[PDB]
Paper text:
Here, using cryo–electron microscopy (cryo-EM), we solved solution-state structures of recombinant [name] tubulin heterodimers, purified in both guanosine diphosphate (GDP)– and guanosine triphosphate (GTP)–bound states, in addition to a structure of MTs polymerized from the same material. (A) Cryo-EM study of Dm tubulin heterodimers prepared with GDP. (D and E) Cryo-EM maps of Dm tubulin prepared with GDP or GTP occupying the β-tubulin binding site as indicated. Unpolymerized heterodimers are very similar to one another. Comparison of solution-state heterodimer structures to structures of heterodimers within MTs recapitulated results seen for other eukaryotic tubulins: As a whole, the heterodimer transitions from a curved to straight conformation upon polymerization. Meanwhile, within both monomers, N- and C-terminal domains rotate relative to one another in both monomers, in each case accompanied by a downward shift of helix 7 (H7). Again, as for the actins, the hydrolysis state of bound nucleotides does not appear to correlate with position in the PC subspace —and is therefore not obviously a determinant of gross conformation.
Residue numbers in the entry:
A (entry chain B): 2 to 54, 58 to 274, 284 to 428
B (entry chain A): 1 to 37, 47 to 436
């Protein structure tokens, strides 16, 4: 019934802080942890993400840079988390995956595991974990995946979920990005049950083109990430029948053991039900920067929020499924599931969220492959990895397994 | 004196049981505390203080549904020991609710059922309520049936299963669970009454004029239907006086125990200005396909047996005239290997409806239970949805990785294949 939330690295912390802030504003919890809302619907299932003692988040904060402590503590909601759950090391990893996976991650991982055990053992019935991080760093991309390996070796029966973000050239353009992204995908493929492939390319495109911000900072992307997290967690936060817990969501949306990489989407990006339904499936609102019309959706979850006619929602869902029937697989009957919630998000009087397991996500896995190959033929910076105890056979296996995943997605695309 | 024990499994089973037992309380006059200022003992038990305790066991693997009853209006009617609950649910997975999660609580549930059974003297059998599309209601129900057939081998085990519909479906693997539980319950059960969700949804949208029906309306209508079925066992009638009579009248062969149920009339509360319907009009409405609970075309199929159960202001001579009128329609074709003839049992107790509900009280009503081959049309709809998925092995790992062999997916399907043939050979 309860979910332990882990956040690692600079990006992981800077998106998780916004996530906790936005869901606290939705629930009514102020910066002091005291409930100041107006509805019991807000606190019907608040124990999923909070512990009562005043309400305290279940967050476990991890980093190898001590400064990110203050950067989270100086935030509006920095004083509500347990001060004991801040496990931040001293020597940072920088931008090297091997440093966060073999040398510096393996030194703090024991303390982080003990903290996670202390937080999890208090749950009456723990349902799973979630972990917000980045595939483009050295602390998150490596240490979080090592943490997932340890947790799955320690909690095999619990659903493990992630909110990974992949790097983009227009955001950081670091030369070592594809190595970290590939090696992190290689670990998320085997040791994860659910993944929300957030793309910095999609966030930058949305902020620049649609929102007309000339130079979108990290705050602009983090706002969209927080909205995405709130939309995809509103089912697990409020009472309902669709996607009640993590395992039901996984059974609903994951057809095959490896095809568990999802495509978020949110609307409106900052207006009636048909406009929401048209924008929700539209490619401009995708957070993975791929065209959903390139491939075929395997499973779709549409979550509407606000005061709307549920009859109108159902009619629009059927109309879209009829008009776009050419993009849904015929071998998964009734693969589009619609849920409605009466609590709108922060600042929106009406909102819609889309979670789609689709084959077009392989497009993204192509990019990380291509950017890898362009610097793997010449061995651009591989000596930065073998000096940390890594081996190039791991690089070859990572590339091979990512390519095999792409091939599987393509097989199920034209099937 | 013979008594029956109800078993409610899963969210759907418990939520249908709430409406059912509420309606039983209104019908008999029992107050929510169990005080009632005959045959009603078939479903209730007497204590020293005079409190009436239902013979109802509420089983769930998640506390959300049961705790709605432990603190609801009828929280004092059921003993806390009868409301069994676990911490971990099946998560829309038959294997979880059958082999691992349900195995943790099956011994406790059986111990409770044995405790209720020892308090009985002439026990007939069990009326098990569940659903097909749910992990609990499909896995734990089949496990419990397999366990009960070893202990209560001689006791009839009826079913009231909820046939999944896309309009209210909660999982995409509902056909998997529907086929899997059907394979493992087809031998232990002996008369299963199936209700299709989409039929109830259509009736609520059409007759009750509800734009977006919820589980409250569907549960109220299904409780009405189950009460109409069991009124023969509760009010000391002249037909279906026992559970074995249900098998005798509706199930000529052990593998065709799937009666089709029709209830008339369904009238919105605001439409009470209507004149009361005659016996002929409701008798004719029995055979229309707007009042069916599992949508199909019985005019194509061949009837095996038909039991009609009337309630309210009903005159036997009017029923006989309706029978004579009905028996002269070319669309009603009986199998030649079964004697051609209806069975009619009339109950004089007025129907009862929940005040504040959308169903208006009626002066008379009729429930028609016919064993027909056309119900197999509802089976094929499942198998197609099965064949579209197992062909690509979609969601199969969710079942094999939780303690069940893959070869049981085919076998179960193969069984239903024979089941389909069982309706083609007979018809
Ligand atoms: N008519 C009606 N149908 C229901 C009701 N509750 C659930 N259902 C149907 O049952 C299906 C799911 O089966 P459930 O019995 O609810 O599953 P469960 O008992 O919660 O067990 P799990 O699958 O492990 O969660 C849904 O698709 C619904 O259509 C109800 O109260 N009334
Ligand atoms: N959208 C978004 N992306 C970020 C943010 N911070 C870092 N990133 C991405 O993450 C990558 C840097 O990894 P980082 O998390 O800083 O490394 P680590 O902290 O050592 O694990 C860059 O390529 C960025 O694209 C943020 O606040 N928002
Ligand atoms: Mg349930």
């Amino acid at each position: 019934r309860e979910i332990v939330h882990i956040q690692a690295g600079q990006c992981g912390n800077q998106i998780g802080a916004k996530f906790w802030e936005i869901i606290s504003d939705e629930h009514g919890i102020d910066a002091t942890g005291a409930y100041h809302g107006d509805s019991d619907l807000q606190l019907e299932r608040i124990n999923v993400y909070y512990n009562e003692a005043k309400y305290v988040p279940r967050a476990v904060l991890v980093d190898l840079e001590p400064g990110t402590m203050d950067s989270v503590r100086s935030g509006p909601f920095g004083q509500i988390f347990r001060p004991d759950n801040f496990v931040f090391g001293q020597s940072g990893a920088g931008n090297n995956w091997a440093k966060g996976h073999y040398t510096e991650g393996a030194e703090l991982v024991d303390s982080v595991l003990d903290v996670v055990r202390k937080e999890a053992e208090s749950c009456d019935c723990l349902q799973g974990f979630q972990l917000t991080h980045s595939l483009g760093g050295g602390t998150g991309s490596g240490m979080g995946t090592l943490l997932i390996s340890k947790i799955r070796e320690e909690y095999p029966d619990r659903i493990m979920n992630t909110y990974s973000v992949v790097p983009s050239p227009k955001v950081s353009d670091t030369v070592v990005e594809p190595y970290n992204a590939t090696l992190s995908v290689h670990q998320l493929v085997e040791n994860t049950d659910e993944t929300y492939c957030i793309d910095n390319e999609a966030l930058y495109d949305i902020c620049f083109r649609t929102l007309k911000l000339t130079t979108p900072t990290y705050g602009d992307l983090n706002h969209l990430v927080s909205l995405t997290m709130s939309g995809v967690t509103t089912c697990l936060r409020f009472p309902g029948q669709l996607n009640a817990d993590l395992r039901k969501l996984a059974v609903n949306m994951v057809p095959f053991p490896r095809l568990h990489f999802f495509m978020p989407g949110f609307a409106p990006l900052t207006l009636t039900v048909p406009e929401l339904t048209q924008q929700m499936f539209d490619a401009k609102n995708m957070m993975a920067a791929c065209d959903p019309r390139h491939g075929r959706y395997l499973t779709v979850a549409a979550i509407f929020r606000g005061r709307m006619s549920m009859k109108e929602v159902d009619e629009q869902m059927l109309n879209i499924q009829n008009k776009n029937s050419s993009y849904f697989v015929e071998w998964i009957p009734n693969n589009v599931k619609t849920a409605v919630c009466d609590i709108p998000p922060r600042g929106l009087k009406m909102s819609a969220t889309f979670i789609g397991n689709s084959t077009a996500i392989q497009e993204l896995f192509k990019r990380i492959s291509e950017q890898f190959t362009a610097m793997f033929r010449r061995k651009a910076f591989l000596h930065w990895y073998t000096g940390e105890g890594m081996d190039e056979m791991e690089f070859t296996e990572a590339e091979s397994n990512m390519n095999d995943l792409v091939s599987e997605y393509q097989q199920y695309q034209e099937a | 004196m013979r008594e029956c024990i109800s078993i409610h499994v899963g969210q759907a089973g418990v939520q249908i049981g709430n409406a059912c037992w509420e309606l039983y309380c209104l019908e008999h006059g029992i107050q929510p505390d169990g005080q009632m200022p005959d045959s009603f003992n078939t479903f209730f038990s007497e204590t020293g203080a005079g409190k009436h305790v239902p013979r109802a066991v509420f089983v769930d693997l998640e506390p959300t549904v049961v705790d709605e009853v432990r603190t609801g209006t009828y929280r004092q009617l059921f003993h806390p020991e009868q409301l069994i609950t676990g911490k971990e649910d099946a998560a829309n997975n038959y294997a979880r609710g059958h082999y691992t999660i349900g195995k943790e609580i099956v011994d406790l549930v059986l111990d409770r059922i044995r405790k209720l059974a020892d308090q009985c003297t002439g026990l007939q059998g069990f009326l098990i309520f569940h659903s097909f599309g749910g992990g609990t209601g499909s896995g734990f129900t089949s496990l419990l049936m397999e366990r009960l057939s070893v202990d209560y081998g001689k006791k009839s085990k009826l079913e009231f299963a909820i046939y999944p519909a896309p309009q209210v479906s909660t999982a995409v693997v509902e056909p998997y669970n529907s086929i899997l539980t059907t394979h493992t319950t087809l031998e232990h059960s002996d008369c299963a009454f199936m209700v299709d969700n989409e039929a109830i949804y259509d009736i609520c949208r059409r007759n009750l004029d509800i734009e977006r029906p919820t589980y409250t309306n569907l549960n109220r209508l299904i409780g009405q239907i189950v009460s109409s079925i069991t009124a023969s066992l509760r009010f000391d009638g002249a037909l279906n006086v026992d559970l074995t009579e249900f098998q005798t009248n509706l199930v000529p062969y052990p593998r065709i125990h799937f009666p089709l149920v029709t209830y008339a009339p369904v009238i919105s509360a605001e439409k009470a200005y209507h004149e009361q319907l005659s016996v002929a009009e409701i008798t004719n409405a029995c055979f229309e396909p707007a009042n069916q609970m599992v949508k199909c075309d019985p005019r194509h199929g061949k009837y095996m047996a038909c039991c009609m159960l009337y309630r309210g202001d009903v005159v036997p001579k009017d029923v006989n005239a309706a029978i004579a009128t009905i028996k002269t329609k070319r669309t009603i074709q009986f199998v030649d290997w079964c004697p051609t003839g209806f069975k009619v049992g009339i109950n004089y107790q007025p129907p009862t409806v929940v005040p504040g509900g959308d169903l208006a009280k009626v002066q008379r009503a009729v429930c028609m239970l016919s064993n027909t081959t056309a119900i197999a049309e509802a089976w094929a709809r499942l198998d197609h949805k099965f064949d579209l998925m197992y062909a690509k092995r979609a969601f199969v790992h969710w079942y094999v990785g939780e303690g069940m062999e893959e070869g049981e997916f085919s076998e179960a399907r193969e069984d239903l294949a024979a089941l389909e043939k069982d309706y083609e050979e007979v018809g």
